[PDB]
Amino acid sequence: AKSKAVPFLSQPEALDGSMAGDVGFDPFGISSVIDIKWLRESELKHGRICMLAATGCLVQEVVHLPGPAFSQKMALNAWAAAPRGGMISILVAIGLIEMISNRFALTATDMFANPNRVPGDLGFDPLSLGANPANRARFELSEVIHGRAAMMGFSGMVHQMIVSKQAPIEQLMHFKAVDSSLMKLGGAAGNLGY
Amino acid sequence: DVAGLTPCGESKEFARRLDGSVKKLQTRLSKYEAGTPPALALQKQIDKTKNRFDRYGKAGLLCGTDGLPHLITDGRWTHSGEFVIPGLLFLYVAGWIGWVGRSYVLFARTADKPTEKEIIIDVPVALSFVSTGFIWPFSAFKEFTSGNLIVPADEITVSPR
Amino acid sequence: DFSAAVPFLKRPSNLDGAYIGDVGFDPLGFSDVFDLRVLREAELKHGRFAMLAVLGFIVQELYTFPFFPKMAPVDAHDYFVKQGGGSQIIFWISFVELFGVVALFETLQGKREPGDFAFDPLGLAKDEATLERYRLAEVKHARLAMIAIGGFIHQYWVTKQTVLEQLGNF
Amino acid sequence: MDSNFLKYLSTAPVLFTVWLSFTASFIIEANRFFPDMLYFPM
Amino acid sequence: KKVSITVDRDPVATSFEKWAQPGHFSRTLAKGPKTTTWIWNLHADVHDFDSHTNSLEDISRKIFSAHFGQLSIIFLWLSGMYFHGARFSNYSAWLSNPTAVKPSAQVVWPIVGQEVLNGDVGGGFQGVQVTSGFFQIWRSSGITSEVELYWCALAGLIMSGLMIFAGWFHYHKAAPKLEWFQNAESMLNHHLSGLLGLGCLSWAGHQIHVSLPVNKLLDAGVAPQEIPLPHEFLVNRDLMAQLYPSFSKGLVPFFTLNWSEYSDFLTFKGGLNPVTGGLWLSDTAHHHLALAVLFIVAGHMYRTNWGIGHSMKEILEAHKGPFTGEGHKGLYEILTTSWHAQLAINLAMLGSVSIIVAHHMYAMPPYPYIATDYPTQLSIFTHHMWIGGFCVCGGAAHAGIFMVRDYNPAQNYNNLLDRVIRHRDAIISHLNWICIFLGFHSFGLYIHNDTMRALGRTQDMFSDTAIQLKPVFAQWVQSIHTLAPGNTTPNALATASYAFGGDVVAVGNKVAMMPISLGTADFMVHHIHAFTIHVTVLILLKGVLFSRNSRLIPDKANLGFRFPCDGPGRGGTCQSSAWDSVFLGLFWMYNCISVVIFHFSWKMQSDVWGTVQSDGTVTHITGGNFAQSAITINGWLRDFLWAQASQVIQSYGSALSAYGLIFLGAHFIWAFSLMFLFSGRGYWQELIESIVWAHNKLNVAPAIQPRALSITQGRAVGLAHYLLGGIGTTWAFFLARIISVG
Amino acid sequence: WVTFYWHWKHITIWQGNAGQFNESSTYIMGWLRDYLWLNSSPLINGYNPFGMNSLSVWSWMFLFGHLIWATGF
Ligand code: CLA
Ligand code: CLA
Ligand code: CLA
Ligand code: CLA
Ligand code: CLA
Ligand code: CLA
Ligand code: CLA
Ligand SMILES: CCCCCCCCCCCCCCCC(=O)OC[C@H](COP(=O)(O)OC[C@@H](O)CO)OC(=O)CCCCCCCCCCCCCCC
Ligand SMILES: CC1=C(C#C/C(C)=C/C=C/C(C)=C/C=C/C=C(C)/C=C/C=C(\C)C#CC2=C(C)C[C@@H](O)CC2(C)C)C(C)(C)C[C@H](O)C1
């Protein structure tokens, strides 16, 4: 009746606890509006992108593909540094992978229409780490939590790069308190523009 | 260059436009003291004007005899960023809006009260539809070839004539 | 029928002892016009802010974190406003308040008590009886603290003395 | 939140006003950060 | 005690359920849309309460709470005007230099280059110049600081919250019964005594204790932050007796009837204050005190609960003579059972009062420094002429709604209404003849002059230098008013207004007011005014008198107030309803008010406003061309519209470029209206059929079947866009012209 | 629209000032002030309180045209 995550709120509907990482944390009631399968597929995919993204920013500073173009320590700087044609090629590769993996089930209306389709289940298991049912639940639990943690970490790492124009590891190695004189929050309305 | 036009970066009339636009702001600035809010407002407007003229000069736009940029829209690729690419962006957005609106009117026909779904919109379903529009070219052409976009002439009411 | 708190005045008719702290004091009559659940949640929220604030005023005079410069608490507001530290506090308070809106809806449906956020980390309230004592006490502390807040904010305005120093002085 | 108040917010004039205010608003913001875009920059 | 308070408790439940059910209020609309007409029908009939409900009680309750909703909106609007003056204005700079700084209380954000609208209004400030005259109001009130403007803004917000609460409370919690609303004697007693009388008395008290000392110090030359706060005048009676020594005697002269002690601050000066060009505030204080006295006296006339007083029914039924049958019998029952009859009267009177306000405020400028702020004088004259014309046409709209709906012949036998309806042919034929006579002999003089000037015959024109049509009666009245001080108003020191004659009042070398001479051009344009007013009366009166039946349609009342026609037979009965005479009379109101505001603008620029150079000579804005050029149509076209549109059309790239854009946009909307006015519904429904076909082809037809607008709605849309475009074109033209040159 | 375009383009060319059409024709205020308003002045001065000339008949026809058109309304 009362959510585990938030006791004063009532437990969200459409959350039965079947999915790993189901803690009843849906205060806004978004689950009622949007089907859980679409939300879980979104959550898992968003998290997987973030897991690679966080690891990538730290790895990009530590390791660079040979050549000046790949040498930028700060990942935001790396965005400009990398050859544009290759980046656009990556964008096309991501699109084609999305197209084949979903089996043309791209839209919210037509995704999950097939009964066997399961949230996040793109049938990607080349080495069959998850083939054993014994370890299936723990793998699912870890993947969902890693994704949530990664999203929080990536948001922090991007914004910390914005506040101080430093790569993530060096900010840990050499720490500067934000002066706060620069980049005051908003203020467009207050000073009547300009 | 094309059609006897001049690149805006070397047009003298473009340069006189930039200079006259800045003198007009500087004479308004000559009536205010340095740190006042009207002085900061006009100095930010002089920076915006100079930035715009600099960007236009280096963009490959062509100026006329009047010193204003002119747009070439005959299809040549050196000028596709003035009509062809904005036009492709528009048609992608417009076809999205049309595909999504059409999907909702077909959904609303199968409703308990079809006309109540159009003055009180089912917002979760309509948001399911707005998300689908990103692949409208493929969905709409497959809709067309599978005989579900176009209805035959004999299921359409017409005037007696 | 007459109100217990004030004998001459009449019992409001929505104040029947349903909510703890009821002494029948509602001369203006807002309880009749508006839902009492909203008002009780507002009373607890206003009181909790005030109870924290009076302690915060006193403690800030007693001890201050070294990194921030020592300032009078009433005038500290302006420094934090420019620094951005005050904006950080507002943002987090607003974020919790967003969940509070959902909780207000839970109260209106009947799933929540007016001021219950299920906060018992230290498990102070062992049983219903001690909780009853605490809820009446919380109401009294909130009401008194709402009076006490502005008690020395207004005194600060008349006399530029720290409330602790002012209490000892004169 | 009340289901009848949400059914009121789903009425055509409310959605039309909110959606076109949101639409007008990100056109305004895009022209604040990226002004004077006479052409697609290419 | 038959006048008593009676209330139903908790009548209507405060629920969001009917919010989710558009159209809940009528049986027709509550079953949902099937064509797009439903959508329009929803908005058209929503505040027509007596069309949804049969009972006068529920109608009255809905009206009372909707009046609280309107008050809540007005208080929010006033609070916003005070807040924009407090926060986004140059008010403080304007107080120091009222003659140099231009008032501005609106600042734009910089987005698409629109920050060019922040022009240099003066006082180290950039913003949109405002013309509502709020700065002069605030100086007359004695505000002197932005802090007091913040407190006025908060008082407005609190009043707005209390009015929206009162509307909710009095509809949903405690709704008065019909017998409460049907207390006309009590309502008049309280609204004369309480509302108007104590309103005037309380304002007189403020003028005496705050406006008079603060404005005496301001006009002496004291800086605004050097002036004592308004309560130090209330307490320190010595400081008040410095400025006005009569205050040394207190209230003993008031109570002992030795009123001539108070002549320091209760004067009868007349004329204008030479420093500010406004009315003496001692005169306004005495004026409001005297008006307060006789509004409180007038609110004791009618009988409520103690036997003293008049019965309004007895007064009405007793006034009957030999020409008028039963007389005013049955009028009390009409005006205490029909809201439309009351709204018809109150709208006609409120519109007339707004027209009087427009004339009296330009001629006797009440506020300090408003007479030489020419954009404000033109703005508030034009604004209150338009409010007056609209409200007068709504008075005839609701007289027609009464006649069609609330009129009952059984209760109106042989009284004044019955007799008007029984000789409406004699009324409408004589009015028709007057409108023809008066268009021929007013506009035909203009055509005679166009022809004579074009033919080279200037000795054959109606002009001052030719055949003269002098306004001798108006000139004679002006003579009497200049002779009145010391003669027929012996204790007055100056004339009521310098428009009648007398001196030139100059403030900051600009003319505040000066005699407005009347000549042949003034004779002609005053008969133009009488012609356009008589024709508007003809259209609206013919709609009211023939609203129920005609020789054409014998049963027009069964079709209603608003119907498009009764078919193409009888030759054609298009636009036969009473609604269609309001529709046609709003065009002629527009014509009338447009000529009035053009006459005012050209005459004031040509003969009143301008600059006073050395030797006392006055150089007017357009140099006295009215006299010899307002006598031809070519003169109005060339020397007024063409010459003075220079500022709107040259405004691009300046702070007045918004007016140039609105000038063009309103020209557009006006022209766009003619698509709806010259067209018919049948064409547009047949065009919509082919568009619907193209939607059926793509399987995207809507379930709410599209319709062409109704015949009445095509007329209403055409009229709305016509008025919006025409008034908007004049609004932009007037404001850019007078901001540049005045 | 056709004859306004033909006439404005030709009077600007015939004056020697084709650049006035070139710059002002791209917005509607250019058509309003530089064609209708600017060229009205010899026409509406065909008669005035200072005399008349041979353009007095067109100056009358101009007003005549405004009257009939509005009477059509
Ligand atoms: C009542 C008359 C009135 C008018 C006409 C204006 C007009 C204006 N004000 Mg002022 N203002 C007023 C009252 C008024 N104000 C009052 C009472 C206050 C005191 C609180 C203020 C305080 C104020 C400030 C502090 C500022 C303004 C500003 C402005 C300007 C821009 C406003 C804007 O774009 O924000 C738009 C803001 C939005 C959030 C957009 C909302 C759009 C939504 C979608 C409208 C929808 C309404 C909704 C659908 C209704 C139905 C409800 C729903 C349940 C169905 C504009 C000149 C600004 C200014 O001048 O800056 C220089 C500014 O900064 N106003
Ligand atoms: C002294 C008594 C009094 C006063 C001041 C008013 C005032 C008003 N009545 Mg009336 N009314 C009265 C007695 C009174 N009424 C009685 C006895 C009846 C029963 C017969 C009615 C029945 C009645 C109806 C049926 C309607 C009104 C309406 C109105 C409003 C008209 C619009 C207007 O000018 O408001 C603007 C002018 C103002 C001055 C705004 C003032 C707002 C408050 C309410 C005024 C009084 C405040 C307070 C007494 C002053 C305190 C002073 C203090 C600071 C010292 C106005 C508020 C109409 C309306 O709009 O309803 C809301 C309406 O439809 N009244
Ligand atoms: C460590 C987090 C983690 C975990 C526990 C899982 C677990 C799972 N995934 Mg997920 N996945 C991940 C990361 C993860 N994946 C990433 C990063 C991507 C791509 C961006 C994906 C993409 C993906 C898809 C598309 C699908 C799955 C599926 C599955 C399920 C079956 C496959 C399996 O058992 O893998 C077991 C996984 C592990 C035991 C951990 C992976 C660690 C590998 C062995 C080493 C990788 C090292 C790497 C190079 C990091 C660099 C180190 C750095 C310091 C430089 C299972 C629940 C399928 C499924 O059933 O969905 C529900 C499915 O359809 N995953
Ligand atoms: C999304 C719904 C939709 C779709 C797919 C179409 C499709 C079409 N319309 Mg129709 N139309 C619509 C809505 C729609 N219309 C509405 C609401 C109106 C009333 C203003 C019209 C008025 C209209 C006219 C007058 C004409 C067309 C024409 C056309 C055709 C050519 C495209 C065109 O001219 O667009 C033109 C579009 C407009 C003029 C108005 C569109 C207004 C908005 C942008 C569309 C509605 C958005 C809607 C609210 C979607 C909400 C979705 C959400 C609930 C999920 C094509 C058959 C033309 C035709 O028959 O040519 C063959 C034609 O002459 N339409
Ligand atoms: C849509 C309606 C509308 C709007 C938007 C405005 C807008 C404006 N009016 Mg106008 N006005 C209107 C209708 C309207 N008026 C009508 C119908 C009347 C006739 C009663 C007037 C009479 C009027 C006067 C007399 C004055 C304005 C003024 C103003 C300006 C300042 C607003 C303000 O603070 O008032 C402030 C108003 C005052 C400080 C004094 C008002 C004194 C009157 C006599 C109060 C009467 C109230 C009473 C209840 C009405 C009884 C009506 C009677 C028939 C029984 C502003 C331009 C003022 C102005 O021009 O300032 C430059 C001004 O002095 N208005
Ligand atoms: C105190 C003033 C007052 C009051 C209370 C009423 C009240 C009423 N009138 Mg009356 N009326 C008034 C003034 C008033 N009117 C005036 C001044 C006029 C002259 C124009 C009329 C002319 C009139 C007619 C001709 C009719 C009414 C009708 C009605 C009734 C229906 C109202 C409705 O549902 O409209 C709903 C409201 C709307 C649809 C609003 C839209 C109206 C315009 C086009 C929008 C405003 C444009 C805006 C101000 C500017 C836009 C800016 C732009 C740049 C975007 C209602 C009893 C009707 C009826 O049948 O009564 C029985 C009717 O036929 N009235
Ligand atoms: C410029 C346009 C124009 C003109 C001239 C008229 C003219 C007239 N309208 Mg119309 N009207 C117009 C626009 C116009 N209207 C528009 C746009 C609307 C839309 C709502 C209406 C709606 C309308 C209504 C609803 C009413 C009128 C009425 C009138 C008449 C007013 C009485 C009058 O002045 O008689 C005098 C005639 C004139 C001033 C016309 C000009 C004549 C001048 C002096 C020259 C005459 C030259 C001479 C005859 C030449 C002879 C020789 C020649 C034959 C060779 C008159 C016939 C009213 C009416 O008929 O009641 C009497 C009436 O009720 N009109
Ligand atoms: C699950 C998703 C989680 C998202 C978490 C977001 C975290 C960051 C959010 C802000 C952190 C604190 C920043 C304070 C920042 C701050 O205080 O700056 C100030 C700025 C206004 O300026 P002021 O009036 O404060 O000027 C200050 C003066 O003192 C000096 O000029 O506030 C805003 O308006 C920003 C918000 C834009 C509002 C529109 C945003 C986009 C709207 C999209 C549609 C509406 C959706 C709902 C929006 C609420
Ligand atoms: C609930 C919850 C928990 C918790 C918690 C917390 C944070 C509890 C904190 C509670 C607090 C801070 C209570 C403070 C009340 C203050 C009052 C009533 C004011 C008194 C002042 C007066 C009367 C005065 C005065 C005066 C004036 C105005 C000015 C002077 O010149 C003079 C004078 C000094 C006389 C925990 C986490 C422990 C777990 C638990 O499971 C659940």
From Swiss-Prot, chain D:
Gene3D superfamilies: Single helix bin
Protein topology in the membrane: Single-pass membrane protein
GO CC terms: chloroplast thylakoid membrane; photosystem I
InterPro entries: PSI_PsaJ, PSI_PsaJ_sf
Keyword Transmembrane helix (UniProt): yes
Location relative to the cell: Plastid, Chloroplast thylakoid membrane
Keywords, ordered alphabetically: Chloroplast, Membrane, Photosynthesis, Photosystem I, Plastid, Thylakoid, Transmembrane, Transmembrane helix
PANTHER family, per the entry: PHOTOSYSTEM I REACTION CENTER SUBUNIT IX (PTHR36082:SF2), PTHR36082
Family label: Belongs to the PsaJ family.
Protein name from the UniProt record: Photosystem I reaction center subunit IX
The encoding gene: psaJ
UniProtKB/Swiss-Prot annotation, chain F:
Ligand binding (chlorophyll a B1): H66
Source taxon at top rank: Eukaryota
Record field: transmembrane: 55-73
Cellular localization per UniProt: Plastid, Chloroplast thylakoid membrane
Family per similarity comment: Belongs to the PsaA/PsaB family.
Subunit structure: The PsaA/B heterodimer binds the P700 chlorophyll special pair and subsequent electron acceptors. PSI consists of a core antenna complex that captures photons, and an electron transfer chain that converts photonic excitation into a charge separation. The eukaryotic PSI reaction center is composed of at least 11 subunits.
Function (record text): PsaA and PsaB bind P700, the primary electron donor of photosystem I (PSI), as well as the electron acceptors A0, A1 and FX. PSI is a plastocyanin/cytochrome c6-ferredoxin oxidoreductase, converting photonic excitation into a charge separation, which transfers an electron from the donor P700 chlorophyll pair to the spectroscopically characterized acceptors A0, A1, FX, FA and FB in turn. Oxidized P700 is reduced on the lumenal side of the thylakoid membrane by plastocyanin or cytochrome c6.
Protein name (database record): Photosystem I P700 chlorophyll a apoprotein A2
Origin species: Rhodomonas salina (Cryptomonas salina)
